[PDB]
Amino acid sequence: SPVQYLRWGDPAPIAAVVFACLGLLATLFVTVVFIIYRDTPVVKSSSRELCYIILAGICLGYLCTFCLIAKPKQIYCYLQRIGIGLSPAMSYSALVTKTYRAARILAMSKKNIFEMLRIDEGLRLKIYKDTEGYYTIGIGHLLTKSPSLNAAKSELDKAIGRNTNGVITKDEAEKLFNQDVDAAVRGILRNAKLKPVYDSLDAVRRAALINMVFQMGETGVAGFTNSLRMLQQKRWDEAAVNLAKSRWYNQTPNRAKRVITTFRTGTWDAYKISACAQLVIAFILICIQLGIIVALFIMEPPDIMVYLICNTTNLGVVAPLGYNGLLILACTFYAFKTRNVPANFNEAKYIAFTMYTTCIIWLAFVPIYFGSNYKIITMCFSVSLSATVALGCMFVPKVYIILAKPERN
Ligand SMILES: COC(=O)N1CC[C@@H]2[C@H]1CCC[C@@]2(O)C#Cc1cccc(C)c1
Ligand SMILES: CCCCCCCC/C=C\CCCCCCCC(=O)O
């Protein structure tokens, strides 16, 4: 009885239970909310099936302490290992597919703007110089500022990752372009006249704005004061008419006509320019962790050594800890890639933050747990902590909006 130890002077098992109980209630609350309001845009805009898997993984995470703190039976030693291993696996391996999808979608987004400026501005598959004599390649991508032709080739190989000999491909030129796009966005966000307009526009209309920036510069686009205001107020037809009078339109009519049209419709008409799969992939990554656990049940049969001490060795912990580490490492990679993506009510910002802490939690777990003389309690807190973080950062801000701010919804 957890009360006995609490009264004998040890509040560790009673605390882990309360922690686990409060966690289960919290997870139960969140899921029910997502069920009732499943049709609300804040729940509809994300993969609902994946969230259910993440919420299920966290629930088992809290249930883990009930196997770590239990009456000494044989199967509880089984439930411990199958729980501490699979519960993070259910959460992170479903979260990686979510982030990976968000990474491909973003990459495909940068693909369109690349094809846009390839048509509007052009491209060179070998090294050249700009109007100021500096070595350049691709779509106006500066390589270096030294007169050395050798210097440019060195910088190119480091950027591409191979011996290019001053020659690249379309795909490699897009890579260099992605950098210049991000740099352009950085400048726009730091420009007081361009920032409000950029924030109001959709994905397509933002590319048309960056198009203008790459032609005239920031200090040039800011000259379209009246037109920029029209775009911000979503008055497309008035913006197009106003832009068609500019010196910019009369100087480069062929290109300007396409950019203006993109502001109009918010489509790529001027330019020639899966859910079920995610569940299967998530299922596969979970079964891999299960195969590891089942194998270790065979290699090293679990046996009983309030506290339930089992005979689980290092290898019985290290292997599923390492696999979970990869799931975490992969998630962070894609989450950091999509950290600024505003889809789903700035969802990804919260996702990235969770993966930052989880890496610290995982990294801290290794020296702490393996140097500890109180392993069971340190395993209870560790699992309940990283489960709480994933619940507090990813789900709570969505529950808040859904219950406290239904108008925002
Ligand atoms: C075999 O041991 C492990 O693989 N680990 C030991 C501790 C545990 C895990 C790896 C990452 C950190 C951890 O503390 C956790 C977790 C967790 C559980 C359920 C839901 C969520 C979102 C996270
Ligand atoms: C942020 C997480 C990224 C790191 C993932 C790296 C994966 C490495 C795999 C396994 C490392 C497990 C460490 C176990 C060392 C054994 C210590 C001991 O025996 O006491």
From Swiss-Prot:
The outcome of changing residue 47 to D is: Decreased constitutive signaling activity
**Glycosylated residues (UniProt):** 311
Cytoplasmic compartment segments: 37-46, 101-278, 337-349
Q: Where in the cell is it found?
A: Cell membrane
> Of which family is this protein a member?
Belongs to the G-protein coupled receptor 3 family.
Originating species: Homo sapiens
Q: What is the effect of changing residue 347 to A?
A: Increased constitutive signaling activity
The cysteines covalently paired via disulfide bonds are 77-310
| Subunit structure, interactors included | The PPXXF motif binds HOMER1, HOMER2 and HOMER3. Interacts with SIAH1, RYR1, RYR2, ITPR1, SHANK1, SHANK3 and TAMALIN. Interacts with NCDN. Isoform 2 interacts with NECAB2. Interacts with CAMK2A.
UniProt topological domain (Extracellular) ranges: 70-77, 300-314, 373-375
Protein name in UniProt: Metabotropic glutamate receptor 5
Q: Which gene encodes it?
A: GRM5
* Transmembrane region(s): 14-36, 47-69, 78-100, 279-299, 315-336, 350-372, 376-397
Task of the protein: G-protein coupled receptor for glutamate. Ligand binding causes a conformation change that triggers signaling via guanine nucleotide-binding proteins (G proteins) and modulates the activity of down-stream effectors. Signaling activates a phosphatidylinositol-calcium second messenger system and generates a calcium-activated chloride current. Plays an important role in the regulation of synaptic plasticity and the modulation of the neural network activity.
**Result for mutant: residue 98 to A:** Increased constitutive signaling activity
**Full-protein residues shown:** 569 to 832 of 1212
